[PDB]
Design a protein. Sequence first.
Lengths: 35, 34
Amino acid sequence: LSDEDFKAVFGMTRSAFANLPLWKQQHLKKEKGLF
Amino acid sequence: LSDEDFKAVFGMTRSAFANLPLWKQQHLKKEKGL
C-alpha cells in the first residue's frame, strides 16, 4: 500500500504501525486480510 | 538468537530474510533497532 492507503486501512501511519509488537502488526494485517 | 526468536522478531524465517536484498535486511534491523 501507499502510505496514504496504509493510513486509510489501519488508521495510523506506517511508522506508528512499525512501533507495534510484531504479533500485533500481524494480527491487524492478517484482520485486514493483507497477506 | 534462536531460529524461533528470530522468526518472532522479524516475522519470517532466516531463510526468507536471507533472500531479501541486503538493504532491506538492514532496513528491518535499523525498524527493530538490532
